[PDB]
Each structure stands twice: as C-alpha cells, then as structure tokens.
From a paper:
The crystal structure of Dhaf4260 from Desulfitobacterium hafniense DCB-2 was determined by single-wavelength anomalous diffraction (SAD) to a resolution of 2.01 Å using the semi-automated high-throughput pipeline of the Joint Center for Structural Genomics (JCSG) as part of the NIGMS Protein Structure Initiative (PSI). This protein structure is the first representative of the PF04016 (DUF364) Pfam family and reveals a novel combination of two well known domains (an enolase N-terminal-like fold followed by a Rossmann-like domain). Structural and bioinformatic analyses reveal partial similarities to Rossmann-like methyltransferases, with residues from the enolase-like fold combining to form a unique active site that is likely to be involved in the condensation or hydrolysis of molecules implicated in the synthesis of flavins, pterins or other siderophores. The genome context of Dhaf4260 and homologs additionally supports a role in heavy-metal chelation. The Dhaf4260 protein family DUF364 (PF04016) contains around 165 homologs that are mostly found in cyanobacteria, actinobacteria, thermotogae and proteobacteria, but are also found in firmicutes and a range of archaea; all of these proteins are approximately 230 residues in length.
The final model includes two Dhaf4260 protomers [491 residues; molecule A contains residues 1–102 and 110–251 in addition to three residues from the N-terminal expression and purification tag (residues −2A to 0A), and molecule B contains residues 1–102 and 115–251 and five residues from the N-terminal expression and purification tag (residues −4B to 0B)], six ethylene glycol molecules, four imidazole molecules, two chloride ions and 239 water molecules in the asymmetric unit. The electron density was insufficient to model the loop connecting the N- and C-terminal domains (residues 103–109 in molecule A and residues 103–114 in molecule B) and the remainder of the N-terminal expression and purification tags (residues −18 to −3 in molecule A and −18 to −5 in molecule B). Dhaf4260 is a two-domain α+β protein. Size-exclusion chromatography of Dhaf4260 in combination with static light scattering indicates a mixture of oligomerization states, with a tetramer being the predominant quaternary form. However, crystal-packing analysis of the Dhaf4260 structure only supports a monomer or dimer and did not identify any higher order oligomeric state in this crystal form. The presence of the 19-residue N-terminal expression and purification tag might also alter the oligomerization state relative to the wild-type protein. In addition, the Dhaf4260 pocket is both narrower and longer than in Rossmann-like methyltransferases such as MT0146, suggesting that it catalyzes the modification of a longer substrate or the condensation of two molecules. A chloride ion is present in this cleft in both molecules in the asymmetric unit and is coordinated by the backbone amide of Trp149 and solvent.
Numbering used by the authors: -2 to 102, 110 to 251
The structure:
C-alpha cells in the first residue's frame, strides 16, 4: 500500500524525453502547458499563491523533468507538474495511439446513471449540478475539502468510501496527493473513475487502481491558453471535448 508515489512515478516514467515544455501559463484556476501539438491542464485554487520564477525556468526543459513538479507539496507547483503530464498523454496523436477515441471537430455521471441506480455512490470533489443528476437515483455521498451544506468533509472518506459500489474522484486529488489513499479506500468498488480536465488519459493508470478516466481533449490550443490566462471569461470546455476511457 505504502508504495504511494508509484502511481505518480508510473505517469512520469511514461513520458519520452523528446517532449519539451514549449509554452506554460499559470492562471487563477488552471495551469496549462503545451508540448508540440499537445496541451495539458492542471487545477489551481484562488487560495494558493503564484510562482512567476519557477514558471520561467521550466520553459525549454523536458516535459518529463517538469512533470516531477507533480510531486511537490506546493500545490501551485504540483498543478504545473500535472499540466506537463497531460501535455504528453492528452496530445491528440498520443491519446489515439493509447486507444482513446474522439472527433476532430461523454459526461461520466450521465453515462453511468443506469448503472448506479439503487447503489451506493461516493464522489470526491466539487462537480456542478451533480446532486440533481445523481441524488434522485442512488445513495449519494459528496466529499469535499470545503463542503457545501449537504456534503461531507474529506476525512469522511475513511468512513464512507469503503462502503461504496461506485466512486468518482476529482483529478485535483493528483495535485494534492490524496489520490493514493482514496484509491485504497475505494479498492472494492465495482468501479473507480478519475474525472475532470486535469485527468491524464494514461491507460497505465488502469494498472494502478483505477477503472475509468474521464477527461478532456483540447482541440483549440491557442484558445485554451486564452481562457486559462483570463483573456476569455469562459469555461475551459469551450476549447475542446470531453473524453472517457475504460479499463
Ligand atoms: Cl474538494
């Protein structure tokens, strides 16, 4: 169990050296990296404080070196590390080579409404409207760092997730390093899904305690950067397409 960096090492060690950090922006809600034609994203908080000097240095470095930042206990740095990971795996050509299907022109909660009916479901993270989609059809528990009124604080994971038939976890858990314990707590679910724009589309994760990955393919590189930089007052989803791979 306490080979806990293993899932991080698996992601990093899959990146070929040839890939460089060609572009990097650290916005209020996401960090974003381009390596060639591929763009990856990682989530930030408005709490956490910027690091303009780290940002400058990573330009030019191997993507795999920058991905080492994912392990940082500084969460803005870790978000950059996840952006670098996702610049490799979520490159449209790389993703296609690893068996991800999508168009050059969906939602995991909607996809699994039938499957989770009458079952116990645990969700870690804040997902808009999720209560409306899932609460009427299943026994739903939502766990967050800073819970809204019907929701549980994160320490409740120890108590709740082992009882769950299905578990969904925000990709923010990669950044804050809660993911490995969450995976162990959920290991007897029928299925565990990692969800959000910062999810790596990395089938190696299916060997590391996950059965589904629900992320995001950027189709408009230039636009994705506009949004992350705050130059468009728009959600990141405008710049691409949701994509899901199952084990
Ligand atoms: Cl949260």
């Amino acid at each position: 169990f306490q080979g806990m960096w293993e899932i991080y090492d698996a992601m990093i060690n899959g990146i070929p050296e040839d890939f460089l950090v060609d572009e990097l922006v650290c916005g209020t809600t996401h960090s974003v990296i381009r390596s060639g034609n591929g763009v990856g994203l990682g989530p930030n908080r408005p709490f956490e404080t910027r690091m303009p000097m780290l940002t400058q240095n990573l330009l030019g470095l191997p993507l795999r070196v920058a991905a080492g930042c994912v392990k940082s206990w500084n969460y803005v740095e870790a978000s950059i590390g996840l952006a670098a990971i996702n610049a490799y795996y979520n490159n449209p050509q790389v993703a296609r080579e690893h068996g991800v299907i999508f168009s050059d022109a969906n939602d995991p909660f909607i996809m699994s409404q039938n499957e989770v009916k009458g079952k116990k479901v645990g969700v870690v993270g804040h997902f808009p409207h999720l209560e409306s989609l899932l609460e009427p059809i299943c026994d739903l528990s939502i766990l967050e760092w800073s819970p809204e009124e019907g929701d549980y604080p994160l320490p409740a994971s120890e108590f709740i997730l082992p009882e769950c038939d299905y578990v969904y976890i925000t990709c923010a858990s990669v950044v804050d390093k809660t993911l490995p314990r969450l995976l162990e707590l959920s290991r007897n679910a029928r299925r565990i899904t990692l969800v959000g724009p910062g999810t790596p589309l990395a089938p190696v994760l299916f060997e590391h305690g996950l059965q589904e990955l629900s992320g995001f393919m950027v189709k408009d590189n230039a636009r994705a950067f506009r949004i992350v930089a705050g130059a468009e007052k728009v959600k990141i989803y405008s710049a691409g397409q949701k994509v899901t791979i199952k084990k």
